[PDB]
Amino acid sequence: GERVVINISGLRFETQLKTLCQFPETLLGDPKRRMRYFDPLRNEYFFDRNRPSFDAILYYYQSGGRIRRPVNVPIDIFSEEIRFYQLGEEAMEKFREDEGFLREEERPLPRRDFQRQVWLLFEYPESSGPARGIAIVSVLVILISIVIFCLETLPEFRDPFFVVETLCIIWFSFELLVRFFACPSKATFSRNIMNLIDIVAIIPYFITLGTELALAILRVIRLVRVFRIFKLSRHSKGLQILGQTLKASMRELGLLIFFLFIGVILFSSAVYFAEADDPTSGFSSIPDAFWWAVVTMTTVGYGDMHPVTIGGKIVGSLCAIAGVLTIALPVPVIVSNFNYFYHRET
Amino acid sequence: GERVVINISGLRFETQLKTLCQFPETLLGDPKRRMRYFDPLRNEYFFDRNRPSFDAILYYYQSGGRIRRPVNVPIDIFSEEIRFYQLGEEAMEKFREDEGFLREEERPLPRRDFQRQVWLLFEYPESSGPARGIAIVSVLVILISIVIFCLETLPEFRDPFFVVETLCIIWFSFELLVRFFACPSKATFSRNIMNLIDIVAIIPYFITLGTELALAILRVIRLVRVFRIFKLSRHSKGLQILGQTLKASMRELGLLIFFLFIGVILFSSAVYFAEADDPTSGFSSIPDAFWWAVVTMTTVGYGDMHPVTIGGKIVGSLCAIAGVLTIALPVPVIVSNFNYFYHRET
Amino acid sequence: GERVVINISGLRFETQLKTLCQFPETLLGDPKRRMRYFDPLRNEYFFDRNRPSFDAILYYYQSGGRIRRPVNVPIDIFSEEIRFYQLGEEAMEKFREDEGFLREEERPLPRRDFQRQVWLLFEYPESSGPARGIAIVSVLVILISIVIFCLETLPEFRDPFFVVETLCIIWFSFELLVRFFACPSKATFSRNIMNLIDIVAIIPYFITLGTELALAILRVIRLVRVFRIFKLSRHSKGLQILGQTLKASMRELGLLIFFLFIGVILFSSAVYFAEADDPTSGFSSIPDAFWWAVVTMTTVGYGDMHPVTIGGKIVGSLCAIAGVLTIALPVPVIVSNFNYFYHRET
Amino acid sequence: GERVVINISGLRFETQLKTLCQFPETLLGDPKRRMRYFDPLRNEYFFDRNRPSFDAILYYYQSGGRIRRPVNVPIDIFSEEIRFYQLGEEAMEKFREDEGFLREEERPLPRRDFQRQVWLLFEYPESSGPARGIAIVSVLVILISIVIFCLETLPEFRDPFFVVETLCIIWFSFELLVRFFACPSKATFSRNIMNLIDIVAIIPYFITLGTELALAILRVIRLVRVFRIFKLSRHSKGLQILGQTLKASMRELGLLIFFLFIGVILFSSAVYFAEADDPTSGFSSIPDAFWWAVVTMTTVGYGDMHPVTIGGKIVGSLCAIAGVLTIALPVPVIVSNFNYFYHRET
Ligand SMILES: [K+]
Ligand SMILES: [K+]
Ligand SMILES: [K+]
C-alpha cells in the first residue's frame, strides 16, 4: 500500500494504491492507461480537469461504488467528467437513477416483415401518412359514437341510429382484431389498460344483440355504454397524464371524501336543532340537511332551503368557511403529482 | 500545546493539542485509538475519509459541542462519518435534533403477562388476528350508532331504536372499562383526547336514563349526542393529522373569522344606504344585509336579496372581490401546517 | 508592500500589507493587536477559527467594505466571526442590512416624570395593570358603538341611543386629548394613520350637533359614521399587517379591477347577441348583462337571468372559466406580500 | 508546454501554457499584460482577487469557452471578476444569456429630422408634454367609443350617436395614418399586433358606410365592433403581459377545455339515468344536463334543475368535487407564466 498523489489543476488529492485497485476498469484502475498521466520528477499525476468533480469521483472508490453529484456542479459537466474517468455504463446508470430519469425502456417490435408493418401502423402514428390517416379516422369514429349516444336519448326520437351504431362497432372490432393479431407479445396484451377499455367498449352491443335475438340490469348496460369516452386516451396525452395522476393520488382522494362526510354529518346535525323551533324552517330531519351542507361546503350554493333563524345563520356561516378549509387541504398534493407527471415529458 | 497535522485524503487540517483533549471519548480524544492513524515520517495522521465532512467535525471540538451538516453533504454520508469519529450518541442526538426528527419516544407496556396481552390487543391492532377483529367490530358499531342518530330524527318514526342504542352503549362502555383496567399508567389515561371523547360519547345516555327513571337543556343533551363521530379518530390517521393541524393553527382561524366580521359590517353598511332610496329594494336594516354579505363574500352566493339600484351593484361587485382577497390570505399557512404534519409520517 | 501569510486552521491565505492597512480598527489593521497572533518561526499568523468564514472576511478588505455571508455558513456563526475580527458596528450594520432586518428603530419617550407616565399608559398596554384596564375598556366602548350604529338603523325603532352615543363620543374625545397632550413630539402626531382615524371617528357627531343646533350630504355623513370599525386596528395586529399588505399591493389591485372590467364588457357583448333572436331571453341590452357577467366570472353565480339559447350557454361556459383564470393571476403576489409582512414578526 | 502557477490570494492554481494561449485577448492570453502580475523569485503570478471566482474563470480556458457562475457567488461579484480578467464582450454576453436576460434589443428611429419627431411623439409618450397630451386624448377617445357602443344597444333609444361615432373614427384613422407614414421601417408595421388591432377597429364602419350608400353577416359585423377594447393595450402594460401569458400557455388552455368536456359528458350521462325513474325529475335527455354539469363543476351553481332522487344527489356531490379537481390542475402553470412575464419587468 503506497500513497499515490493526483493533482487536479492545482488541487492535490492523496490516496493509497489499494483504493484505486478495487475497480480495474477505471482509468486509474488499470496500471497502463493512468501510467501516461503520471509525471516522474514530482511523482504526481496531472489532470487539467474540473476540481469540484474529482472530489466526488474519489469518493466512488472509497465508498465502493456510491456516486453523487455535488450540488454546485451542473449535471452535464459531471456526466462528461464521469465519461473521462471511464467509471462505466454501470456507474453512469447509478448516477442517472440518482438524478431520477429511469425511463430508458424501449418497447419491442414483431419479428417478421409483414407483422412489424401492421403493428407499426396501428401503434405508431408518427411514422407514415397512412398512420396519421388511421389516427384521424379513429378519432372521428369515436366522436360520432358519442354524438349517437346522446342523440339516442333525446325525447323527440324515442332505424338510422342502429345503422350508425353498428358501423361504429364494426370499426372498433376491426381495429381491435388487427391490433391483437399483429402484437409482438400476446402476454402483454391483457395487461394494457387501453385494450381493456376497447373490449368494454364493444361488449354491451354484442350481449344486447345476443339476448335480444336468442330492467335494472338493462339500466346497468345502458350506463356501461358511456365508457367510449375513454377511447380518446390513446390519442390524447393529457388524459394519460390525468390517469397517472389519479392512480398516484388514491389516499388523498379518500381523505377528501372522508373529510367531506364528517363535515356533512356535523353541520346537518347542527342546523336542524337551531331551526327545529321555527315552523317556517324547511329542515325536517338530519338526513334532510345533507344536500344543504354539501352545496354550502363546496360553494355551489344552490341552497336546498334558506335558514330562517339566527342560530341557523351562524351555523351556515361556519359551514361556508369550513368547507373551504376542508377541501383546500389534500388538493396541493394532487396538483404536485400532476406537475410532476406533466413536466416529466420534457 | 503542540500543533497536530491531520490529512483527510490530501486536504490538510492543523489544530492545537488542547482542542482535541476537550472531548476524550472521540477517536482523536484518546491518545491510543488515534495513535494507530498517526504516521511517524511525516508527523501527520492519514484518514482516507470524505474531505467536506471533516471540516464540520473539526468545528465540533472548536465550538465545544456545536454540530452542523454542510448544505453540500447528504445526511446519511455525514451520519456515517459522525459514527466513524465516535463523537457519541449525545452528539448524534444533537445532529438528529438539528435535522428535525425528535419523535424517538417509545410508549411502555403493562408489567405483567395477563395485562400486557389485554393492552396489546386493544391498543395495538397490527399485532394479531383478534386485534383486527376488534378493530373492524368497533368501526361497525360506531357506524350503526351514527345511522341510528339520524334515523331517530326522521319524521316518519317520531322500540327497536332504544334496543340498538343500548347495545351500542354496552359495547362502548365495555371497551372503555377494558382499556382502562389494562393500561400501564393510569396517570396518562386522563390526558389522552380520545379517552375523553369516549367518556363524552357514553355520558348523555346515562344522564337521560337517570333523570328519566329517577327543554333547552334537553336540546343541549341532544346536540352533545353528535360527538360519536369523533370516535372514528382512533381508527383513522388522516383525522388525527387534521386535529394536529387545527391545534397548530389557532391564530390563523381567529384572523379568518375576524377579517370576515370586519368585511360583513362594512359591506352591509354600504349596500343598505345605496338601496334605501329605492322602494323595490329588500334591504331594510344593516342587520338585514349581514346574510347577503356572508354568502357574497364566500361565493356560495345564495342571495338573501338581489340589489336593485346601480350603487348597490357597484357595492356588490366590490363585496364579491373583497371576500376572495380576505379568505385567501390566512389559508396558505394552514395548508403548510397540514403538509408538514402529513408528510412527517414518511 | 510585503505579502503576509495567515493560516486559518490549515487553510492558508496570502495578502499584501497595504490591503490590511485600509481598515485600522480591525484586529489585522492595528500592528499590535494582530502582533500576538503572529508566529516567528514560520512567519505566519495562526487562527483556530472557521475556514469558510475567513474567505468572506478577506474580501471585505479587498473590496473596500463589501460584506457578504457564504450561502454555506449559518448567520449566527458568521456574526460571531465578524465580532472576533472586530470589523465594527458599521460593517456589522451592513451585514444586518444584507440579511434584511433594518427594523432597529426605537421610538422615544416624553422628557418629564409626569408626561412619560401618561404616554406610557396610553401608548404601552404591556407595562402595567391599569394599562390593560384602559385597553379592555377601550375595546368594549368601540364594540358597543358599532352595536348602536346597526341598532339605530333597525326599523322597529325608527332617547337611549343618543345618550349611549354621546357617552361613547365623550370617551373617544377624552382619550384623544390625553394621547395628544402627552406625546413626546407633536410633529409626528399628524402623520400617524390611527390618530387621523380617531379624528374622523369623532367629527360627524360634532358637525351634526352644530348644524342641528345652529339630503345627499346627510347620506354622506351617515356613511362616514362607519369608520369606527377601524379604531380596532390599534388593538389588533392582524389588521395592521392587513393595512401594510394593502398598501404594498396597489398595482395588483388595479390590475384585478381592470381585468374584471375588460371581461365584463366582452362577455356582456357576446351573450346579448346570441340571445337577441330569442323572445324568451331576458338580456335586453349590453348594460343589462353586466351583473350576469360579474356574478358568473366571480362564481357567486346568482344569475341575473338564465341563458335560454345554445350560443348563450356556450358563452356562459367560457365566462365561468375565464373569470377563474382572470382572478387567479394577480392574487399570489398579494398573498406573498401578506406572508412577508406576517412572518416578519418572528 | 510548461506548467504555470497562479496564486489567487493563497489558493494556488496550476495549468499548462497551451491552455492560456487558446484565448489571446484575455489578460492571461497576451504575454505582456500578465507579465507584470508575474513574480520572479517564486515563479508565480499573484492576484489579490476572489478565490471562488477564479475556479470558474480557469474552466473557461479548459472548456474552450464555457462560462458558469458558482451557485455560491453573487452575479455582480462574478461580473466584475469577468471584466477584470478581460474575457470579452462575447464571454460576458454568454454569461448574461446563462443568467436569462437576453432582452438587450434597441429599436431604431427614423433617419430624418422631421420624421424622427413625429415617430417619437406618437410611439414614445415619456418624452415630452405634447406626447402625454396625445396619450390622454387617445385614452379618452377610446373610452367614449366604448360608452357609445353600449348606449347604442340600449332599448330607450332604438342622430347624435352617428356624429360621435364618426368623430371617433376620424381620430382613429388620423393617428393610424400619422403612425404609418412616420415609421422607420414599413416592413415591421404589418407584423405588430397592435397595428392590426387598429385596422380591425376602423374597418367595419367603412364597410357599413360602403354597402349602405352603394342578416347573420350584419350580426357578425356588429360583434366585430367590440374589438375597440383592445386598443387600450397600447396604454396598459398589464394587458400586454396578459397577452404574452396567454400566448405562452396555449397547451394548458386546451387541456382545461378538454378536461371540462370529458367531465360534462360523464356526469350528464350519470345524472339522467338516476333521475329517469322519477316523474318529478327535470332532466329529460343527456343533452339536457349539460348546463347543469357545467355550472356544478365550475361552482357558479345556478342549477338548471335540482336533483330529486338519492342517486342523483350522490352523482351531484361527486360532480361538485370533480370540477374543483379538474379545474385546479392546469392553472398553476398559467399563473407561473404570469409571474415570470410580470416580474421580468424589474
Ligand atoms: K363558488
Ligand atoms: K355559487
Ligand atoms: K345560486
Which DSSP string do the residues of D3-33 spell out, in sequence order? EEEEEETTEEEEEEHHHHHT-SSSTTTSTTT
Residue from C22, C60, C285, C308 whose CB has the most chain D CBs within 10 Å, to mutate: C285
Nearest to C10 by CA among D228, A21, D10, B228: D10
Q: How far is CA D158 from the centre of its chain?
A: 41
Facing residues of D13 across strands? D6
* H-assigned helices in B100-236: 113-123, 129-153, 160-181, 193-213, 216-224
Q: What is the three-class DSSP state of B44? A: strand
Please state, as a whole number, how many other Cβ atoms lie within 10 Å of the Cβ of residue C180.
Answer: 13
**Chain A residues with CB-CB distance to B300 below 8 A:** 295-296, 299, 301, 303, 320
Contact yes or no for D202/D169 (Cβ under 8 A):
yes
User: Residue D102: enclosing H or E segment and its boundaries?
Assistant: none
Q: Name the DSSP class of B229.
A: G
* H-assigned helices in A276-346: 289-298, 310-328, 331-343
**Chain A residues with CB-CB distance to B10 below 8 A:** 5, 12-15
Q: How far is CA C236 from the centre of its chain?
A: 13
Ligand having the closest approach to the CA of D300 = 2
Span from the CA of B126 to the centroid of ligand 2 (angstroms):
45
Nearest to C86 by CA among C39, C36, C28, C31: C28
Q: Which of D15, D71, D286 sits opposite A153 (nearest CB)?
A: D286
CA distance C263 to C289: 12
Where does residue D9 fall: left (phi above 0), alpha (psi -120 to 50 degrees), or beta otherwise? Answer: left
Instruction: Specify burial of residue D66 (Cβ count, 10 A radius: 0-12, 13-18, 19+).
Output: middle
Ligand having the closest approach to the CA of D327 = 1
Nearest to B302 by CA among D273, D265, A313: A313
CA distance C333 to C246: 11
For residue B12, report the phi and psi dihedrals to the nearest 5 degrees: -80, 135
User: Residue B45: enclosing H or E segment and its boundaries?
Assistant: strand B44-47
Distances (CA, A) of D129 to B47, D124, D133: 75, 11, 6
Instruction: Specify burial of residue B20 (Cβ count, 10 A radius: 0-12, 13-18, 19+).
Output: buried
CA distance C200 to C196: 6
CA distance A160 to A165: 9
Q: Which of A154, A222, A338 sits opposite D273 (nearest CB)?
A: A222
In the structure grid, which three cell numbers stand for residue C282, read together?
331576458
The amino acid sitting at D122 is F
CA distance A149 to C290: 37
Q: Please indicate the experimental technique that yielded this structure.
A: cryo-EM
Cell 334496543 appears where?
Answer: B163
User: How does strand C38-39 pair with strand C11-16?
Assistant: unpaired
**With helix as H, strand as E and coil as C, how does C153-166 read?**
HCCCCCCHHHHHHH
**Chain A residues with CB-CB distance to D3 below 8 A:** 46
Please state, as a whole number, how many other Cβ atoms lie within 10 Å of the Cβ of residue C116.
Answer: 14
List all residues 6 or more positions away from C14 whose beta carbon is below 8 Å from its beta carbon: C3, C4, C5, C6, D7, D9, D10, D46
Q: Which of D52, D290, D327 sits opposite C324 (nearest CB)?
A: D327
Nearest to C20 by CA among D194, D9, A64: D9
CA distance A289 to A272: 7
Evaluated on CA atoms D131, D133, D136, D138, the torsion sign reads negative
Please state, as a whole number, how many other Cβ atoms lie within 10 Å of the Cβ of residue D267.
Answer: 24
| Chains with 3 or more CB pairs under 8 A to chain A | B, D
List all residues 6 or more positions away from A152 whose beta carbon is below 8 Å from its beta carbon: A158, A161
**Chain B residues with CB-CB distance to C239 below 8 A:** 258, 262
For chain D, give the number of residues. Answer: 346
**Chain D residues with CB-CB distance to A338 below 8 A:** 329
CA distance A74 to A82: 13
Nearest to D10 by CA among B10, C53, C28, C5: C5
Domains of chain B and CATH, by start? 3-99 (3.30.710.10), 113-235 (1.20.120.350), 250-342 (1.10.287.70)
Cell 387541456 appears where?
Answer: D255
Span from the CA of A295 to the centroid of ligand 3 (angstroms):
10
- The CB-side HSE value for A78 (13 A sphere, CA atoms) comes to 20
Span from the CA of C314 to the centroid of ligand 3 (angstroms):
19
Cell 372590467 appears where?
Answer: C261
For residue B11, report the phi and psi dihedrals to the nearest 5 degrees: -85, 100
The amino acid sitting at A81 is E
CA distance B235 to A182: 51
CA distance A292 to A298: 10
Q: Name the DSSP class of D189.
A: T
Facing residues of B8 across strands? B11, B47
In this complex, do A298 and D324 lie within 8 Å of one another by their Cβ atoms? Answer: yes
In this complex, do A150 and D285 lie within 8 Å of one another by their Cβ atoms? Answer: yes
CA distance A88 to A28: 13
Instruction: Specify burial of residue A67 (Cβ count, 10 A radius: 0-12, 13-18, 19+).
Output: buried
Contact yes or no for D66/D60 (Cβ under 8 A):
yes
Cell 384602559 appears where?
Answer: C134
For residue D184, report the phi and psi dihedrals to the nearest 5 degrees: -50, -45
In this complex, do C335 and B328 lie within 8 Å of one another by their Cβ atoms? Answer: yes
Q: Which of D10, D72, D260 sits opposite C14 (nearest CB)?
A: D10
Span from the CA of D299 to the centroid of ligand 1 (angstroms):
5
**With helix as H, strand as E and coil as C, how does A169-192 read?**
HHHHHHHHHHHHHCCCCHHHCCCC
The amino acid sitting at B242 is L
CA distance D142 to D128: 22
Distances (CA, A) of C39 to B141, C20, D131: 82, 18, 72
The CA angle D115-D121-D126, to the nearest 5 degrees, is 140
Resolution of the entry in angstroms = 2.9
User: Residue B276: enclosing H or E segment and its boundaries?
Assistant: none
Rg (Cα) of chain C, in Å, rounded?
Answer: 33
**Chain A residues with CB-CB distance to B151 below 8 A:** 287
CA distance D323 to A293: 18
In this complex, do A320 and B302 lie within 8 Å of one another by their Cβ atoms? Answer: no
The amino acid sitting at C137 is V
